[PDB]
Write a protein that binds this ligand. Structure first.
Ligand SMILES: Nc1ncnc2c1ncn2[C@@H]1O[C@H](COP(=O)(O)OP(=O)(O)O)[C@@H](O)[C@H]1O
Ligand SMILES: Nc1ncnc2c1ncn2[C@@H]1O[C@H](COP(=O)(O)OP(=O)(O)O)[C@@H](O)[C@H]1O
Ligand SMILES: Nc1ncnc2c1ncn2[C@@H]1O[C@H](COP(=O)(O)OP(=O)(O)O)[C@@H](O)[C@H]1O
Lengths: 18, 418, 219, 424, 440
């Protein structure tokens, strides 16, 4: 589950950057 | 309306100090027996005891049924009172013991207040929104309201073939849809109240009704459809499984304050008609912590028990069950008391009686059973009416008593025996 | 065939004696029998007690709305002061009733519950010479039931087939008179009463009429 | 507040009043007296709890009012709900849908418990989206995390025919038996005017999406009726099916229970069958019990009877306790002696404590003296009656003059029979 | 392990090769004459030649009638059917008495049927047809065989079937990479599911991702199933199946269910004879044990005339308890053992004797040994002494409660004090009868 949280954090950073 | 044998009995007729009056709410005489009934009626109102049992004993016609009915009247409608004849236990669908247990459970009631609401009106529009919900417009004489409806309810609407202009009663908690008709203007009147009806139903139920509703399933649309079609007899509930689980849920709601238990009475007439295996089940059953108060009535003395074929016992009831029972004796009326009963019955039944007619009718009640003097009133009044009179003159009772015989006189006639 | 099939006639109110909308009590708080095929031991004993949805949480989700998702990517005049008050009033009523009903619809647990019955229920032909359905030879009851024992139960199909030769010849009895169903029942009926019976007969004759097709030769 | 179970005849008996050495106390947890009988009852209770040996049978015999039923309730309260205690009267087997023998068999099997333990992998979460083209994908959510699953045709057919929808809190197991758990609290306001009778709104789960269900539950061996029909749990709510085949009862269910026990998925906990008023059985039922007691996994029988040398039902023969000698040979008999002036007064005191009645010591003396003459069971009823007659008199304690107010209203079997000189 | 019952200690009749008993062979003590007699009837069963023969175990209660009646069952082993019923099981609500008797009669006749079946399974990797020369004019694409390659955990093998299997295979809609089942003689193809090596990793599907089969691609075994004639009868009376709307007698349970001779004999004895004379099945005629036979009705006793005189009957052991006694269902007809003289003319009577004190000490010792009790010789002697005064069964039954007293008292074995104590906590029939005779 914490891996899902980490993965979503990374994805949100990418979306905000683009 | 429709006078009946006991419809003059309006209560036990005690005063605030317990002691019985000579004449009261329909009842006259039976000082000691009415006193005893007054003592047990507060056992009933106490809601504290379980399975307590009373035997109203005495000759036929001595008010024992009348005293049981007087108890039922003394309590009102807020507590159950179940009349059974001991003869009724001989069911052909159900084992005697289970008829008896079902009746034990009819006598425990359960009051429950549901503040509940139903939406009703002429449907002005339906739009389902895979369906997330359905918006439905409902109209009454006090305006229109737009409802959002759970999408599962949207099945019921299509099953009832509701469409705009119909009048429906979609119930809020069940989601149940009933199509009351087509609206008047196109058939049933447009509902004249508010579209969102809300009311506190405080009506009460019983444990047995609950058991029966839990015995068999409903709906399903599968193989169950054919269970909706077979002959539907009654079958025994399971002692240590279902009816106990019912007890658990009822206790859960009592704890929550949603429901209140009202222990009632089971009144068994002609208890001498129970089988011995019924008597013994019964005295294994009214020792349970959940039983009602049971009132037994028997009108025969020392005689042989049913189903033993030789065992003799007082009141036709085994000594085992005659223990663990409180006996109230009822006794034969004096001529004065029978005169008073005849008068009370006459004024209940709508009859006027001349004093000398009443006195000789009571004397008949001394040569013959009281119930027969009470029988003669209406046909005697009918003769008087057909002779244009208002009162029963003695000329009518002392002649109607020739058309109709009583048990003893007709038995003397039968003694020609060919 | 007698068109003199009788039809009983009654009053409207007779056919409407046992109905009442807002004087009857809700028995849905007591029906244990309706849970057994449909509700779980785990659901009532474990899930609902933890995830009970308090009045609070549903009043909370009645706050500002939730935002939309984004799944596409892959990388591996004025207003009446009383009107708004009334709207607030009935919104509060609405939410308190969601609470009331969502609590009342999950208040009692099954007598057994679906997994208990699943554990207890054995494969369907419990004590027969013929085995239950087997997924394959990988599992034990494939290697316990002989086909020669299966050939001897003669399901009703072969009963019809092997009797067909004498069904064709020896079935000739008819009742000397025949009438439509036991009666029709005319009145000024409740409007819902007729749709429901017609729907029930649709629901029956749609399912097991193909199953009556095998009996057609006898009928 | 008054609840379903209120003050009945044996309500005060909260257990069997014994030491750890099984020695009975003079007065203890509800029960009073019957030292010999209660020690014997304790011994058979101990062999119930050990559970090692099968079909043991005990007859509690003695006069009406000794405490046979009281001792049975003491045994039943001493024993926890874990061990099945089945109480019937001998009259309950005289069925119309069954014979005497089949009903007696069903009672026997109702007295054997089976603790299921079941252990299943589960997927649980709020459905975020469903897609279907046949094949599609399903998006499940728990408050911790979200995932896609790909759907095969059987799963798709049990999404559509279940009418699962976005927001439904759904639950799926290996070898799927998908059940709808709840409704999302976001797709809400549906009860702005109505909800479906089955619909619930409680919130989506937390933690991992895949979890393990442990479920433990005591069925009775009578779960045989769960496999006697096509849909069969119903018959546990209406007694329904009557003579289910012995060819499935005694081999299939027992064999599969043994297999469960050996795998460790179940365990039999043998209990008690208490037949009260057992003299009501017919020689057919008694001669059935003969062989039933010999069987591999019978419960322990307890029987109670108050009969002397009497006729056996279904016969013209007479025997002790009204039950056949070939069955008494199979029983251990516990006799119960009546109470003296010391124990009658004490059980009346216990009953006053239970019914919450306060009595003068004079009133206790009078009530005991009355009970020792007519009947024990009658003095117990006068307690409540005097409480009520004193409650209307604006009193607070039952008094000697009040016992007499009751003693003339409600007359015993003795005086009641003595007043049948009228012969209507 | 399982719980100890009344007869858990008897393990056989206890007979040596000459058919005698030494004194206490295999859990039974004494009764040498009776054990020899039913030693003969054990071999009467094993020879499979006779039908409807009947033996009546007659003696006082507690003299081992039931014990050695089921010691016969131990001698026969689990192979043959031994069907116990008590004389009270015949009275039924659903079905007539004599029909219960017939059901039990051919519930005691077994039929063990042997049949090899042979199977192919595995992940199917190759599925290619084999074209051949045109059988007739020039259509082309003449399939003569079809090659199919199956993988298991043992190895991968390719197999040729004839084209009918190609059709069935396609109609079963199997694909390359799933796991099938082929039944060689019958010719069926069954799809048992896509192979788990193509795992359910994010597939939620309920269709079994079945694991790759273990063992050889081809496997055969002789299935050996034993059924009673009654199982065949019942399965023919109320059959299963998801068709034929009569089979949807599914809400209903099954009263009225008295089976019919047309079926019983006309349709079901022929198939058993066929399987037997074909080399597929062996008849295993067993035993019907009826204890408390005295409980049967006169109608039942007269039906047993016909039933015992049949060629298609088991051998029947009756056990009876009563003296000269009124036959049930008669108006005061008295006859021995409660059984009509007419039926007693048809049974060989084995008499069971009433035990000596020595034999009772032995039985008490064996019962203590079986229940797991340790008992001192003094307590054993006292149990024997109080058991000479009353019935053996009471003497035996005192063991476990006395052992519980011993355990409570911290002792490892029954000291004489504990049997003394229990013998005053509990009464026997005779003592209780005296109490009842004294008090009213
Ligand atoms: N105490 C009473 N006061 C007035 N009327 C009475 C009284 N007792 C009996 N009656 C009348 O006399 C009739 C006698 O019948 P009932 O009391 O039913 O007989 P039983 O006592 O055998 O039940 C009653 O039906 C009732 O109409
Ligand atoms: N040992 C006891 N301790 C407490 N109360 C008792 C005892 N024995 C009897 N009682 C009371 O007296 C009543 C009569 O005893 P019960 O066991 O019902 O009679 P029986 O022995 O005929 O079954 C009981 O219902 C109970 O209220
Ligand atoms: N010959 C024997 N050897 C060993 N134990 C015996 C023998 N006979 C009787 N018993 C024991 O005594 C009990 C009484 O015998 P049983 O056959 O059950 O009585 P009945 O003859 O009335 O059927 C049995 O349950 C068994 O435990």
């Amino acid at each position: 589950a914490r891996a899902f949280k980490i993965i979503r954090e990374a994805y949100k950073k990418y979306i905000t950057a683009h | 309306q429709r006078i009946a044998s006991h419809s003059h009995v309006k209560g036990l007729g005690l005063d605030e100090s317990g002691l019985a009056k000579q004449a009261a709410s329909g009842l006259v005489g039976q000082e000691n027996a009415r006193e005893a009934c007054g003592v047990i009626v507060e056992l009933i109102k106490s809601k504290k005891m379980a399975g307590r049992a009373v035997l109203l004993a005495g000759p036929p016609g001595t008010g024992k049924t009348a005293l049981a009915l007087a108890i039922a009247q003394e309590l009102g409608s807020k507590v159950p009172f179940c009349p059974m004849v001991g003869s009724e236990v001989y069911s052909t669908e159900i084992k005697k013991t289970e008829v008896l247990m079902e009746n034990f459970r009819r006598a425990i009631g359960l009051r429950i207040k549901e503040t509940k609401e139903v939406y009703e009106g002429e449907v002005t529009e339906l739009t389902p929104c895979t369906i997330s919900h359905v918006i439905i417009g409902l109209k009454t004489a006090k305006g229109t309201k737009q409802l959002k409806l759970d999408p599962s309810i949207f099945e019921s609407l299509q099953k009832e073939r509701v469409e705009a202009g119909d009048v429906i009663y979609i119930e809020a908690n069940s989601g149940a849809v009933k199509r009351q008709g087509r609206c008047d203007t196109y058939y049933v009147p447009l509902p004249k109240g508010d579209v969102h009806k809300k009311k506190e139903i405080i009506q009460d139920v019983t444990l047995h009704d609950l058991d029966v509703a839990n015995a068999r399933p409903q709906g399903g649309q599968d193989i169950l459809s054919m269970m909706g079609q077979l002959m539907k007899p009654k079958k025994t509930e399971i002692t240590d499984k279902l009816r106990g689980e019912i007890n658990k849920v009822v206790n859960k709601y009592i704890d929550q304050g949603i429901a209140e238990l009202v222990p009632g009475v089971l009144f068994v007439d002609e208890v001498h008609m129970l089988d011995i295996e019924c008597f013994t089940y019964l005295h294994r059953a009214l020792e349970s912590s959940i039983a009602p108060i049971v009132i037994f009535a028997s009108n025969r003395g020392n005689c042989v028990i049913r189903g033993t074929e030789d065992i003799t016992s007082p009141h036709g009831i085994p000594l085992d069950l005659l223990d663990r029972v409180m006996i109230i004796r009822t006794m034969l009326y004096t001529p004065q008391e029978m005169k008073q009963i005849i008068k009370i019955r006459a004024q209940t039944e709508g009859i006027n009686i001349s004093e000398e007619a009443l006195n000789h009718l009571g004397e008949i009640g001394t040569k013959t059973t009281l119930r027969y003097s009470v029988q003669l009133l209406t046909p005697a009044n009918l003769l008087a009416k057909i002779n244009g009179k208002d009162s029963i003159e003695k000329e009518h009772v002392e002649e109607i008593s020739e058309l109709f015989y009583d048990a003893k006189s007709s038995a003397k006639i039968l003694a020609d025996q060919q | 065939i007698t068109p003199g099939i009788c039809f009983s006639t009654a009053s409207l109110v007779l056919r409407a004696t046992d109905v009442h909308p807002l004087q009857r009590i809700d028995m849905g708080r007591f029906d244990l029998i309706g849970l057994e095929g449909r509700v779980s031991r785990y659901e009532a004993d474990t899930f609902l007690p933890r995830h009970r949805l308090s009045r609070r949480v549903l009043l909370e989700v009645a706050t500002a709305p939730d935002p939309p998702p984004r799944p596409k990517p892959v990388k591996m005049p004025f207003y009446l002061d009383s009107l708004e008050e009334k709207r607030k009033r009935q919104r509060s009523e609405r939410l308190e009733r969601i609470f009331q009903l969502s609590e009342a619809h999950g208040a009692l647990a099954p007598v057994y519950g679906t997994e208990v019955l699943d554990f207890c229920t054995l494969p369907q032909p419990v004590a027969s010479p013929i085995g239950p359905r087997s997924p394959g030879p990988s599992h034990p009851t494939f290697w316990t039931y002989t086909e020669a024992a299966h050939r001897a139960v003669l399901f009703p199909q072969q009963r019809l087939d092997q009797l067909s030769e004498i069904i064709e010849r020896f079935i000739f009895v008819m009742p000397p008179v025949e009438a439509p169903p036991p009666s029709l029942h005319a009145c000024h009926p409740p409007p819902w009463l007729a749709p429901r019976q017609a729907a029930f007969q649709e629901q029956l004759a749609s399912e097991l009429w193909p199953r009556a097709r095998p009996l057609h030769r006898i009928v | 507040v008054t609840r379903i179970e209120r003050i009945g005849a044996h309500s005060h008996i909260r257990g069997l009043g014994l030491d750890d050495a099984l020695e009975p106390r003079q007065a203890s947890q509800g029960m009073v007296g019957q030292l010999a009988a209660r020690r014997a009852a304790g011994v058979v209770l101990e062999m119930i709890r050990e559970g090692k040996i099968a079909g043991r049978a005990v007859l509690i015999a003695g006069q009406p009012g000794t405490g046979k039923t009281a001792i049975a309730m003491g045994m039943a309260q001493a024993l926890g709900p874990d061990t099945p205690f089945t109480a019937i009267a001998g009259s309950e087997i005289f069925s119309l849908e069954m014979s005497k023998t089949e009903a007696l068999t069903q009672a026997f099997r109702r007295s054997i418990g089976v603790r299921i333990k079941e252990e299943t992998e589960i997927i649980e979460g709020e459905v975020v989206e469903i897609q279907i083209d046949k094949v599609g994908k399903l998006t499940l959510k728990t408050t911790e995390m979200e995932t896609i699953y790909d759907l095969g045709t059987k799963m798709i057919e049990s999404l559509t025919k279940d009418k699962v929808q976005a927001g439904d809190v759904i639950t799926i197991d290996k070898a799927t038996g998908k059940i709808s758990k709840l409704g999302r609290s976001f797709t809400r306001a549906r009860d702005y005017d109505a909800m479906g009778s089955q619909t619930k709104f409680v919130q989506c789960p937390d933690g991992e999406l895949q979890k393990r269900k442990e479920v433990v539950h005591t069925v009775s061996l009578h779960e045989i009726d769960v496999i006697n029909s096509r849909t069969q749990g119903f018959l546990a709510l209406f007694s329904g099916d009557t003579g289910e085949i012995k060819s499935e009862v005694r081999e299939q269910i027992n064999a599969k229970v043994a297999e469960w026990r050996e795998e460790g998925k179940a365990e039999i906990i043998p209990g008690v069958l208490f037949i009260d008023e057992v003299h009501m059985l017919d020689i057919e039922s008694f001669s059935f019990l003969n062989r039933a007691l010999e069987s591999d996994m019978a419960p322990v029988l307890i029987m109670a009877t108050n009969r002397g040398i009497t006729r056996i039902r279904g016969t013209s023969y007479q025997s002790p306790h009204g039950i056949p000698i070939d069955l008494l040979d199979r029983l251990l008999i516990v006799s119960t002696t009546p109470y003296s002036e010391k124990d009658t007064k004490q059980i009346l005191r216990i009953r006053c404590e239970e019914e919450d009645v306060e009595m003068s010591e004079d009133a206790y003396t009078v009530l005991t003296r009355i009970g020792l003459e007519t009947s024990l069971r009658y003095a117990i009823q006068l307690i409540t009656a005097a409480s009520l007659v004193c409650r209307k008199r604006k009193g607070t304690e039952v008094q000697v003059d009040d016992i007499k107010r009751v003693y003339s209203l409600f007359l015993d079997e003795s005086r009641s029979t003595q007043y049948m000189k009228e012969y209507q």
